[PDB]
Design a protein around this ligand. Structure first.
Ligand code: ZN
Lengths: 162, 99, 355, 157, 115, 267, 122
């Protein structure tokens, strides 16, 4: 879902994007070298969305220029969050052209098992919804690509069907 | 256990209204049959991915063998294609030299 | 390199991303729903809105309202899609009364997602967005009343419907039941706020049935009688009673015409001169009557039909104005009377007699 | 209206009579029976939920002192944020029927005194609670506490 | 023919409904006048059940007319979708052969995959 | 015409509703007076329930009369075939509509050349419908195709296609010169108008949007269908801001699969 | 040898879905000379779909027997000669790719030159 038509003239560049948006670069190559990089920063989020459709899950939130967190330098960041079909677990992902790929997986309480059990919670109804996030480091994980890794993660959070 | 059986069960149920011995009923029937078929297909997908992840993390040697096989095959693809370009290049070189 | 001015881009980003929530906050306040303050939820990147309680007046009895307000846990709202205008509200329910045959027999929390999206005129957090949410909540509650009643009455069953029908789909907004001795037919019940009625829809799923569901002839009567008294066991009993006769009725050639009166009172017309009335009854009973004779007078007849002499003896084989009283059959001879059989063109005996 | 005025007149001229039901039944049961046949065969949940759905920066719980199991409850708060220092507990009192009303904060002036940092926190606190609108919740006040502490820390350094 | 029958039949239905409602009101007031203590004459009672029977029979006739008209129009429209007589018969025979062949091919494939 | 079938079906539904309404009226009146706890509500509820049924009967009769004013003027085994055929095409018609949206494929691989007459006949087959559209083909340079498409008295489109794959589009007005001095097609030029440049950008986005992987005829068919909608330009306003002009420009955006006018700023 | 089997089973699943969609599309394309051709194509597609179902069943039966270790355990949170032989193929392949780059940039320059020179021969 990212595709560019570039049109090179005599001292300008014209860029048309697959969703109705036109930009005009210049004869300096830093501009064009940063443009493509800022677009390679959004590909990952749209990749996770198009697979959250295919493989069953359901998206809860999507933004492709977020409005919180630190301040980026080349472009602007993107984030999503997407729920298990059984409903219990959830994934969330953030990416940026400068500081990218910060993924976190979120659990139902009574399976984090180091949680200070608050006092007002006495029932077992409130021990089925979900509160604790827990960050997972991207490195040292199976799958060569970023998209490929996601496949092995969003399949391991599924009921033990073996 | 044997998800393939109910996979073809849903597949055959998708054709139930045709092989038998005014639009709302058929539309409802195809809606439920198709959604069930897609759900079973996605569950089979999930089982294969879980098994693949377990096997890959247990022993990467088979993954390495598959990588070797694909790299060799694509090597032959590149060699054959560059050979084809050279043959046609010689042909058109002589065609243009005949002038 | 240093010609980008990153701070202005960041301010425009957050301002555009965050200003949609202000209208929705103001509207949830304006319609008197108790919410919490708009707040970042979980991770820093995404904002969310949580609503503490749904409006008290939803139109059903207090006891249902309690059971509802002991099974809700959350009503969060979120934003998604391109151009930042799609809302998704999410509900989670505890102590599910009923199980399906889908893989929804798990640890008793059940998630339900509703989706709203305003038009390009009439802004993103307009009055209309909550109106549809309240309408969907009302529909969910009105279906939940009947679901609760059916779940309560389930353990006390006359044991005849236990092997007849099983529950297939329950999503708190649409109820899909599967019935038939081979589980070859399906019914769907769902409330809507457009007409303020229960819309029951029939369908055929399964490898053992006809080209249709053989119940579309009395769809209107079934809908009307369900709207009169919203009970599930009564409809199940009616379907069990009327499954057998309509299966043989629908195989008749179409001379013969079928007029569905009030349920279990089918009227068969031979061309434009003869009539027959068929009543279905519980415990394997069907009543056949001539129908061309008025039940209250003898001198006057019906407008467009004529009596059929000698019909009473023909009906009595299978067991003046003497044919005006019904004759009882036991759902077995009716098939032989209606099924096309070779002559003792594959013509049925009733067609032969009438001809 | 049209085509049915006689029925309306008959019903209105017949209503609130001791034998209306008998008259209607006796005049309308037989034809209906003949044509169709036989007839048909402590702590409120809102507080518990809102405590369950708060950020793990807070671990609010019941006050060891004061009364309990009533419409009015008392909570004591602790803040555990790696990026912020330690502050007074900032206890709260929740009245009965918490929805459609607002809770109140019990001020403790002597606790926040004797330190420029703590009284700066306190004056920012007073400013923010004067800036809070009506019908507010407790999570909003807790987030206001966290943000006021952060702003005071930023102003100090 | 059915359409003009409909136009002729509609006012009769309206008149039948009118007289049915009127006689219902008259019978109700007469019965409730018997029930309480005061007197009135009965005369032409014109019982309720006869009016119900007439209304139901006329509605059945109208329904039959509409069903016949719709069936005839649908049959004509569907037949027009698909000059010498034997060529027409041969075309019909070929069409039914093609339909039967398609149906039996689908059934044979369904039997082959499962069962 | 097929409107008579729908009219007859609605008449059947109306008469069934009328009969059901009469039966409901008489049954509800036969039921009698209920309890309804206190006395005052008991008085009002019966009257409120009784009025509604009669009002429904009157409304049904009125709408039935409105329809009446609206309306106007071996074999068996054959029919069994016909009523089967139309039952198949619809049955697949939904099934093809639901499976294409949820495409499960991940990659075309496992584990272009066309005759000129093919392209010519395909373009003629596109040209036969849409009478306002007129298409002219040429090949000044090699096997690449140059097509001039004229639309009404408004639009002139130049399309360069590389082996039936659409590659480049430039649109211009009516009075503007489209041919060069030599008389051939002018490929490299501009329309000298802001709105036409904006719609060239829109056409580039459209050609970048419609991309089937193995059916190339449907792609050009969809492109021509989308281009068809532009004939109505300058007569239709935006669906959001109401007015025609925004910053001096008329609505120049036609949404895909829902062909309605829009300003560029209105998205 | 088993991961390849899992990938093959997955691929056959997508082909099964695609063949079902193609069957429904082909049934849609039938409108009452060539009708026998379409019928033979339908028979071929159905029989190859049946063969695909048989192959999927065979793959599932083979891979089912050959889980000791569950999921959610191997996800890493915050808290011998094969390698040697692989490297040569990577380096060799990389070298081959580099060579292709030189040929490609050269051919594109040739086509650019011929375009520029031929554009203005008039
Ligand atoms: Zn506009």
């Amino acid at each position: 879902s990212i595709q560019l038509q570039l049109n090179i003239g005599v001292e300008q560049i014209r860029v048309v994007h697959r969703d109705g948006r036109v930009i005009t670069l210049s004869y300096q190559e830093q501009e064009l070298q940063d443009f493509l990089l800022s677009q390679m920063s959004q590909h990952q989020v749209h990749a996770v969305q198009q697979l959250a459709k295919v493989m069953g899950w359901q998206v809860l939130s999507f933004s492709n220029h977020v409005g919180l967190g630190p301040i980026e330098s080349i472009g602007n960041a993107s984030a999503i969050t997407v729920a298990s079909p059984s409903g219990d677990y959830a994934i969330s992902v953030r990416n940026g052209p400068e500081s990218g790929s910060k993924i976190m997986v979120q659990f139902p309480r009574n399976q984090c098992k180091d949680l200070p059990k608050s006092d007002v919670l006495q029932d077992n109804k409130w021990s089925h919804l979900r509160g604790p996030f827990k960050e997972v480091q991207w490195n040292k994980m199976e799958g060569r690509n970023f998209v490929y890794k996601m496949e092995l993660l969003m399949s391991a959070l599924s009921p033990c069907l073996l | 256990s044997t998800l393939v059986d109910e996979l073809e069960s849903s597949f055959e149920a998708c054709f139930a209204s045709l092989v038998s011995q005014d639009q709302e009923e058929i539309r409802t029937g195809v809606d439920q049959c198709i959604q069930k078929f897609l759900d079973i297909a996605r569950q089979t997908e999930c089982f294969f991915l879980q098994k693949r992840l377990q096997l890959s993390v247990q022993k990467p040697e088979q993954v390495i063998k598959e990588d070797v096989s694909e790299l060799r095959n694509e090597l032959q693809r590149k060699d054959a294609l560059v050979q084809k370009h050279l043959t046609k290049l010689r042909h058109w070189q002589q065609v243009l030299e005949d002038i | 390199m240093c010609a980008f001015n990153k701070v202005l881009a960041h301010f425009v980003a957050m301002c555009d991303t965050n200003m949609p929530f202000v209208g929705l906050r103001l509207e949830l306040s304006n319609l008197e729903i108790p919410h919490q303050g708009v707040q970042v939820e979980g991770d820093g990147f995404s904002h969310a809105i949580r609503l503490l309680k749904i409006p008290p007046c939803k139109g059903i009895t207090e006891e249902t309202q309690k059971a509802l307000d002991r099974s809700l846990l959350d009503c969060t709202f979120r934003l998604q899609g391109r151009n930042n205008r799609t809302w998704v509200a999410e509900l989670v329910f505890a102590n599910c009364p009923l199980n399906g045959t889908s893989t929804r027999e798990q640890g008793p929390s059940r998630h339900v997602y509703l989706t709203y999206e305003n038009l390009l005129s009439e802004p993103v957090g307009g009055r209309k967005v909550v109106e549809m949410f309240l309408n969907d909540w009302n529909s969910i509650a009105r279906l939940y009343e009947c679901v609760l009643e059916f779940a309560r009455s389930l353990p006390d069953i006359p044991a005849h419907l236990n092997i007849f029908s099983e529950v297939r789909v329950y999503n708190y907004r649409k109820l899909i039941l599967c019935y038939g001795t081979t589980k070859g037919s399906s019914i769907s019940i769902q409330w809507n706020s457009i007409h303020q009625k229960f819309h029951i829809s029939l369908g055929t799923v399964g490898p053992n049935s006809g080209c249709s569901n053989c119940h579309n002839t009395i769809l209107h009567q079934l809908q009307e009688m369900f709207n009169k008294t919203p009970n599930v066991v009564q409809l199940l009993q009616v379907l069990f009673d009327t499954q057998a006769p309509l299966n043989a009725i629908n195989k008749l050639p179409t001379c013969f015409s079928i007029l569905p009166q009030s349920s279990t009172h089918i009227r068969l017309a031979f061309r434009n001169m003869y009539c027959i009335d068929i009543y279905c009854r519980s415990r394997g009973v069907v009543a056949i009557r001539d129908g061309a004779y008025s039940l209250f007078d003898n001198s006057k007849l019906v407008e467009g039909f004529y009596p059929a002499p000698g019909l009473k003896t023909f009906l009595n084989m299978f067991v003046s104005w003497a044919a005006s009283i019904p004759t009882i059959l036991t759902h077995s001879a009716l098939n032989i009377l209606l099924l096309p059989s070779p002559t003792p063109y594959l013509c049925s005996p009733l067609e032969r007699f009438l001809g | 209206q049209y085509l049915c005025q006689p029925l309306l007149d008959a019903v209105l001229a017949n209503i609130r009579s001791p034998v209306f039901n008998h008259s209607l039944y006796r005049t309308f049961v037989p034809a209906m029976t003949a044509i169709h046949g036989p007839p048909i065969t402590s702590i409120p949940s809102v507080l518990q939920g809102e405590v369950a759905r708060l950020d793990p920066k807070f671990l609010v719980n019941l006050d060891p002192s004061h009364c309990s199991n009533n419409g009015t409850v008392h909570l004591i708060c602790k803040l555990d944020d790696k990026d912020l220092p330690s502050v007074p507990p900032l206890e709260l009192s929740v009245p009965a029927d918490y929805p459609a009303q607002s809770p109140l904060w019990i001020d403790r002036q002597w606790q926040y005194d004797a330190n420029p940092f703590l009284q700066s926190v306190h004056r920012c606190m007073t400013s923010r609670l004067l800036q809070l609108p009506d019908k507010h919740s407790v999570t909003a006040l807790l987030n206001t506490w966290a943000q006021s502490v952060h702003q005071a820390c930023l102003s100090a350094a | 023919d059915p359409v003009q029958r409909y136009k002729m039949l509609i006012p009769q239905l309206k008149e039948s409904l009118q007289t049915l409602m009127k006689v219902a009101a008259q019978n109700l007031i007469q019965n409730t006048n018997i029930d309480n203590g005061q007197k009135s004459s009965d005369g032409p009672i014109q019982r309720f059940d006869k009016c119900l029977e007439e209304f139901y029979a006329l509605c059945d006739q109208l329904e039959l007319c509409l069903r016949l008209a719709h069936e005839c129009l649908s049959q004509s429209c569907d037949s027009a979708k698909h000059l010498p007589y034997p060529q027409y018969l041969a075309v019909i025979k070929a069409q039914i052969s093609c339909a039967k062949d398609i149906h039996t091919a689908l059934l044979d494939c369904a039997n082959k995959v499962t069962g | 015409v097929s409107v008579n079938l729908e009219a007859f079906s609605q008449a059947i539904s109306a008469i069934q509703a009328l009969r059901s309404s009469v039966s409901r009226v008489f049954d509800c009146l036969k039921d009698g007076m209920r309890n309804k706890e206190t006395l005052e509500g008991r008085e009002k509820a019966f009257i409120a329930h009784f009025q509604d049924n009669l009002h429904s009967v009157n409304r049904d009769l009125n709408e039935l009369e409105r329809l009446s004013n609206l309306v106007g003027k071996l074999y068996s085994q054959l029919l069994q075939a016909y009523k089967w055929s139309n039952k198949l095409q619809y049955h697949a018609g939904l099934a093809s509509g639901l499976l294409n949206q949820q495409s499960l494929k991940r990659s075309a691989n496992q584990m272009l050349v066309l005759p000129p007459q093919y392209v010519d006949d395909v373009i003629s087959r596109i040209d036969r419908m849409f009478p306002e559209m007129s298409i002219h083909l040429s090949r000044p340079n090699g096997t690449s195709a140059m097509l001039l498409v004229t639309l009404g008295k408004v639009l002139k489109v130049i399309v360069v296609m590389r082996s039936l794959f659409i590659d480049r589009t430039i649109v211009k007005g009516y009075n503007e010169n489209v041919y060069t001095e030599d008389g051939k097609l002018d490929i490299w030029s501009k329309s000298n108008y802001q709105v036409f440049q904006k719609v060239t950008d829109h056409a580039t986005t459209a050609l970048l949007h419609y991309q089937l992987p193995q059916m190339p005829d449907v792609v050009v068919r969809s492109f021509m269908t989308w281009l068809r909608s532009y004939i109505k330009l300058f007569q239709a306003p935006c669906q959001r801001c109401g007015k025609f002009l925004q910053d001096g420009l008329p609505p120049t955006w036609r949404d895909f699969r829902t062909l309605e006018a829009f300003h560029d700023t209105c998205r | 040898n088993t991961a390849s089997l899992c990938r093959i089973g997955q691929e056959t699943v997508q082909d099964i879905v695609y063949r079902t969609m193609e069957i429904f599309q082909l049934l849609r394309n039938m409108q009452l000379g060539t009708y026998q051709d379409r019928l033979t194509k339908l028979q071929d597609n159905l029989r190859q779909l049946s063969v695909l179902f048989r192959k999927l069943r065979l793959v599932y039966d083979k891979c089912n027997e050959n889980d000791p270790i569950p999921v959610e355990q191997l996800i890493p949170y915050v808290e011998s000669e094969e390698r040697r032989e692989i490297a040569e193929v990577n380096k060799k392949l990389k070298q081959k790719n580099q060579q292709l780059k030189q040929i490609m940039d050269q051919l594109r320059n040739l086509i650019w030159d011929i375009n520029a020179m031929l554009a203005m021969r008039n």
